[PDB]
């Protein structure tokens, strides 16, 4: 009658098992202790439920793998809060060595506390595992509601009714790090042969505990399911030199790499759920239905007529309508707020589909999966998009793509095997990611001057797509630099507001560049700008680049490989520009 094993098992038995596992040296011994507990629980369950069942090992497992808790929200509990509380309850001298050590704990804490507890708290535990869960539930729920005093009272119950040793373990469950000395994967494997695979397509300990309650009954065709959080497929880092072999000497896809929030979308008619990469529920943000949220109302009607159910994998971007650009994560500005203040909007960049109307697609080829994707919805630029991809088979094509990508201020490229299927939580297989070899030194901080510009297209024709940048020729002692040598073209995409602000600040200073009557202050190579700007009116940008290579396109006789503007350095005057001599020393060092 809604009976549970957890209501019968002292939290003390769970803790004595954790203590034995942690103190065991060998893996074998660690596993044995876990097995003995798990096995007793299973036999008890069978006896308890003979004449009845959704009950399972979940109440224990959620405490054994606290980092996998998904039902309960954050506790909001700091080591420093526990410290004060213990100092009260144990009546420690407020200025003594024990009190200070607790208060001055440097980020383990459970062990420091336990040593203070062992000789002064002799109480025997009284809580069942179920009652421990109830109090943790209370802590989390009260934290959500910022009811500080109720959090304390729940903590107070946990502490006054638990043994010193149990308190050691409570602290670790609260912090979410047990330090058992045995891995999460081992825990899963010991529990059920299928537990890990199931967990990968349902990020839910309860589901795994309940569905795999019987260790001798497997699950067939474990797969991605509507409204269950699967772990995203991951990309392995790839050295661009080996890319043709890595793609099984056959044709492959090159796809744009977006740095947003990895997000999967689940749809059934008017009902929507969204899961982040860790399997937390973001439906409150994006929208459970077409009349609420920051995204769903705007994309519900993009879906094609025949599509009732679908599951998508992709990336959430912050899109600027006025510039038609995605804003990068790293900015001095507030992306979340501007999204809320309607300055920016949420855009779902989609690169995969795992289900359409009850066809499951995990095992289809990425090739087939992409085909299907174009049938799911009609893209709306700036709300819901299909990530751009192309076919390629050559290393040089990949060099081209990376070159283009960095130019547009993207930070890398993706490469994908068309034959490949979708493997949740696996890194490698069909998905590779490629980024520039950035070596962190002076090469990360090239401080150079903007000397010229190139216009964007159509309506973005008022904004610049690229800047031309130069270094200073070292001037006679006393005077400011008067001659600059071009060094590199670099992308000007408004992926951060400071670049937008910079463009508007410089707008009034551009002058038409004439090949036949060029300004004396700017010396060029092959590459000429559309417009230039007098040095004293300009701004220094800090540039990250992977390599300095020879070039006849720039006056310096060389240029920057994969250059990206990192910062606008308006804390510098134009004449503080890096010189030819600096460039020269940098190159050969």
């Amino acid at each position: 009658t809604s009976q549970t094993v957890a209501s019968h098992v002292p939290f003390a038995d769970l803790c004595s098992t954790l203590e034995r596992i942690q103190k065991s040296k060998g893996r074998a011994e660690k596993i044995r202790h876990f097995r003995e507990f798990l096995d007793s629980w299973r036999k008890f369950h069978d006896a308890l439920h003979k004449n009845h069942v959704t009950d399972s090992f979940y109440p224990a497992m959620r405490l054994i793998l606290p980092q996998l808790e998904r039902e309960r929200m954050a506790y909001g509990i700091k080591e420093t809060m526990l410290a004060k509380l213990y100092i009260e309850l144990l009546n420690l001298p407020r200025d003594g060595k024990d009190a200070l050590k607790l208060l001055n704990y440097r980020t383990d804490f459970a062990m420091i506390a336990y040593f203070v507890l062992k000789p002064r708290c002799l109480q025997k535990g009284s809580l069942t595992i179920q009652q421990v869960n109830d109090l943790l539930d209370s802590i989390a729920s009260n934290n959500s509601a910022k009811r500080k005093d109720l959090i304390k009272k729940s903590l107070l119950q946990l502490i006054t009714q638990s043994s010193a040793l149990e308190q050691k373990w409570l602290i670790r469950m609260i912090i979410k790090d047990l330090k058992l000395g045995v891995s999460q994967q081992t825990i899963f494997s010991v529990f059920h042969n299928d537990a890990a695979e199931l967990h990968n397509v349902t990020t839910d300990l309860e589901k795994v505990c309940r569905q795999l309650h019987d260790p001798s009954v497997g699950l067939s065709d474990i797969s991605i399911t509507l409204f269950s959080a699967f772990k995203p497929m991951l990309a392995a880092i790839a050295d661009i030199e080996h890319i043709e072999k890595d793609m099984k000497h056959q044709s492959f896809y090159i796809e744009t790499k977006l740095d947003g929030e990895r997000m999967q979308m689940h749809k059934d008619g008017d009902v929507y759920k969204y899961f982040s990469r860790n399997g937390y529920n973001y439906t409150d943000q994006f929208g459970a239905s077409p009349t609420e949220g920051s995204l769903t109302p705007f994309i519900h009607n993009a879906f094609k007529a025949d599509i009732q159910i679908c599951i998508l994998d992709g990336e959430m971007m912050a899109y600027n309508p006025n510039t038609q650009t995605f804003m990068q994560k790293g900015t001095k500005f507030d992306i979340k707020r501007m999204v809320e203040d309607s300055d920016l909007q949420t855009c779902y960049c989609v690169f995969d589909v795992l289900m359409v109307n009850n066809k499951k697609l995990g095992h289809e080829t990425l090739r087939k999966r992409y085909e299907i994707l174009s049938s799911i919805f009609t893209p709306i630029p700036g709300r819901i998009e299909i990530v751009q991809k192309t076919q390629a088979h050559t290393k040089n094509e990949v060099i081209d793509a990376l070159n283009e990508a960095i130019d547009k201020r993207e930070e890398g490229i993706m490469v994908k095997q068309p034959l490949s299927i979708y493997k949740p939580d696996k890194r490698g297989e069909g998905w590779l990611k490629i980024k520039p070899e950035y070596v962190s030194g002076l090469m990360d901080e090239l401080d150079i001057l903007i000397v010229g510009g190139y216009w964007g297209k159509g309506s973005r024709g008022g904004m610049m797509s690229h800047f031309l940048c130069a270094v200073a020729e070292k001037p006679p002692p006393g005077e400011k630099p008067s001659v600059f040598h071009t060094l590199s073209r670099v992308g000007s995409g408004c992926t951060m507001k400071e670049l937008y602000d910079l463009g508007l600040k410089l707008a009034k200073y551009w002058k038409p560049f004439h090949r036949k009557a060029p300004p004396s202050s700017i010396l060029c190579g092959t590459e000429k700008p559309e417009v230039y700007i007098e040095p004293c009116n300009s701004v220094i940008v800090q540039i990250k680049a992977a390599e300095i290579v020879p070039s006849d396109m720039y006056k310096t006789g060389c240029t920057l490989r994969f250059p990206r503007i990192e910062k606008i350095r308006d804390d510098k005057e134009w004449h503080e520009c890096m010189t030819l001599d600096d460039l020269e020393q940098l190159r050969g060092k």
């Binding site: 019968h8 038995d13 507990f37 007793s40």
Partner: peptide
């Protein structure tokens, strides 16, 4: 009704 202590300390 089975008692847990028989199952655990076994």
């Amino acid at each position: 009704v089975p008692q847990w202590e028989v199952f655990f300390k076994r």
